[PDB]
Design a protein around this ligand. Structure first.
Ligand SMILES: COc1cc(-c2cncc(-c3ccc(N4CCN(C(C)C)CC4)cc3)c2C)cc(F)c1C(N)=O
Length: 293
């Protein structure tokens, strides 16, 4: 951190800022946490510090730094110049191959989080709890990697131990599952948080698929529920739409003339069941995406 120069702020919010920095000439991503989001900084750090968390589709950790006297919190990761999937989707259309590469890579990263790996260099099961296109980064190889583990929760099957932590920050409201919005989520059940990830993943699938061209037709980039909720929607705005109206992102008619998008639409709906138990697992989504190729 003492040998890094901040060059440009690639992202800002009430959470903090992410900066492009140079570390010995190599570009790095620098997330500067507000003192209010100190819990998120530690959760991400301890996962990267202790857990064997390394995968092609998880944002690569480099270093974490903190000085409190007031308090500055730094998380330094690899820098992906193409930006978030959210940014990338506004600027490019896709074909079948690149669309599948994107969503299969996300599914591969989510499966690796959710799967408990026993052993020495193993890992507990991890649920993300804030999955969204802005938290997924596009690499130059055309694959994606998941970022921002600040809300993540861990589970070990052996001890049946669930580390959820107390974080004042809740997930992004636009992506909250119905059981979160109606507050019926089993808060001490690890399976509940995985199923929350699957819901958000279904929404990201919809965001990507709209940008896949079929028969000369493509939709514009839109966030989930763009047509029914305002920008920066409230908890109550989301709950009315998802739980009362029971709305879900609409499937454009042109998708049903393309076999890939028809299969993706089927996948989406199997992430969007009101019943969290009915939703597919991450590993099953990855296998289905693989068969689509
Ligand atoms: C440090 O930690 C994190 C780092 C990142 C992260 C990693 N590599 C690249 C970026 C990045 C994202 C977007 C853009 N764009 C520039 C151009 N565009 C404008 C012209 C409109 C849009 C924005 C550039 C770089 C980021 C943010 C992500 C994280 F989620 C974390 C986390 N929360 O841990």
């Amino acid at each position: 951190a003492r040998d890094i120069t901040l060059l440009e702020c690639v992202g800002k919010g009430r959470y903090g800022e992410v900066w492009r920095g140079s570390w010995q000439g190599e570009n790095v991503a620098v997330k500067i946490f507000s003192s209010r989001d100190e819990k998120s900084w530690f959760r991400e750090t301890e996962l990267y510090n202790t857990v064997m968390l390394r995968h092609e589709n998880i944002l690569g950790f480099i270093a974490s730094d903190m000085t409190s006297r007031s308090t500055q919190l730094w998380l330094i990761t690899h820098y992906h110049e193409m930006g978030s999937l959210y940014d990338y989707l506004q600027l490019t259309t896709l074909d079948t191959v690149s669309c599948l590469r994107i969503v299969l890579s996300i599914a591969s990263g989510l499966a690796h989080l959710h799967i408990e790996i026993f052993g020495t260099q193993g890992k507990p099961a991890i649920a993300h709890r804030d999955l969204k296109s802005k938290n997924i980064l596009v690499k130059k190889n055309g694959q994606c990697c998941i970022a921002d583990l600040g809300l993540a929760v861990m589970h070990s099957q052996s001890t049946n131990q669930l580390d959820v932590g107390n974080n004042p920050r809740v997930g992004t409201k636009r992506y909250m599952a119905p059981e979160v919005l109606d507050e019926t989520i089993q808060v001490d059940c690890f399976d509940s948080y995985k199923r929350v990830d699957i819901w958000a993943f279904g929404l990201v699938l919809w965001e990507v698929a709209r940008r896949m061209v079929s028969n000369g037709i493509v939709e514009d980039y839109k966030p989930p529920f763009y047509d029914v909720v305002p920008n920066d929607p409230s908890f109550e705005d989301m709950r009315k739409v998802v739980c009362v109206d029971q709305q879900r992102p609409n499937i454009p008619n042109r998708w049903f003339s393309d076999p890939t998008l028809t299969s993706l639409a089927k996948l989406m709906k199997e992430c969007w069941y009101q019943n969290p138990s009915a939703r597919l697992t991450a590993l099953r989504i990855k296998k289905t995406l693989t068969k689509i190729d």
